[PDB]
Amino acid sequence: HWRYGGDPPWPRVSPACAGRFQSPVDIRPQLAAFSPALRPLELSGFQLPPLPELRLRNNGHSVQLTLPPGLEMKLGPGREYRALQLHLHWGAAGRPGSEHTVEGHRFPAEIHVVHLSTKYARVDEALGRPGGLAVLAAFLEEGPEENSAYEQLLSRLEEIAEEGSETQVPGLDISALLPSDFSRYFQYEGSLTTPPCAQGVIWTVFNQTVSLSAKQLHTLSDTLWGPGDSRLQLNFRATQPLNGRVIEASFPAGVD
Numbered sequence: 089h090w091r092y093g094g095d096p097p098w099p100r101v102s103p104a105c106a107g108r109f110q111s112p113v114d115i116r117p118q119l120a121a122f123s124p125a126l127r128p129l130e131l132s133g134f135q136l137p138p139l140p141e142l143r144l145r146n147n148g149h150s151v152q153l154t155l156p157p158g159l160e161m162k163l164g165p166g167r168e169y170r171a172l173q174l175h176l177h178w179g180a181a182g183r184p185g186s187e188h189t190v191e192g193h194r195f196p197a198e199i200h201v202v203h204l205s206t207k208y209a210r211v212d213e214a215l216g217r218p219g220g221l222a223v224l225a226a227f228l229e230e231g232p233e234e235n236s237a238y239e240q241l242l243s244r245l246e247e248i249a250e251e252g253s254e255t256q257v258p259g260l261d262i263s264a265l266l267p268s269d270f271s272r273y274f275q276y277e278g279s280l281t282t283p284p285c286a287q288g289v290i291w292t293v294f295n296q297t298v299s300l301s302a303k304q305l306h307t308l309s310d311t312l313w314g315p316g317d318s319r320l321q322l323n324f325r326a327t328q329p330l331n332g333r334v335i336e337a338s339f340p341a342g343v344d
């Protein structure tokens with residue numbers, strides 16, 4: 089096991105974290121390869137009914153929501169996935185904590201929805217295989233008012249403040265935690281951003297952000313406890329070198 093912002097350096101315990109094709113990465117849109125074959129993402133089953141409830145847990149490194157069977161995500165022909173869980177990465181008071189960056193810019197927080205390829209019946213079989221797992225990532229930014237979809241989760245953090253504690257939340261519209269623009273995104277091949285840092289993961293990063301109130305962002309970053317009696321904050325990995333990888337863009341970056 090392992091921690092953010094301190095020893096042991098991940099390769100000392102998970103050597104695969106020293107791989108060449110790790111995540112997250114710094115995205116530079118003017119250098120991304122424009123790929124018009126990347127069509128709008130397609131989701132189905134994400135609008136969940138209130139029952140059954142979903143497991144929400146503080147695992148010491150993030151807050152993780154377990155997703156039920158039946159959520160489908162298609163990146164394109166031959167690339168169909170089932171969603172497994174989502175979790176978040178964040179900073180601290182006045183300090184951003186997203187995992188991916190854009191031209192070196194770090195955003196307040198980031199959401200990851202993790203999926204299993206329909207080629208595989210179990211996560212174990214997919215680990216390390218190219219395209220075995222896919223993650224949808226979106227940046228969380230500050231907007232003027234409360235995000236009602238996020239409030240259904242964020243209002244439940246207080247009761248799972250202790251590391252290892254868990255609770256149950258009503259079904260909600262998972263797609264409402266994501267951007268509304270499904271057409272504009274970046275895509276590349278990388279790794280899990282925690283040990284064991286397994287490679288072969290298809291990363292799709294929305295260009296559009298989602299807006300949370302400043303109060304919500306403080307709730308996310310200030311409520312949970314991690315290992316020891318440290319606050320669960322700054323739970324992101326440093327960006328990793330591309331090492332020749334090409335990041336694709338589904339849209340024309342543009343001008344400015």
Ligand SMILES: [Zn+2]
Nearest residue numbers: 175177200281
């Ligand atoms: Zn993550």
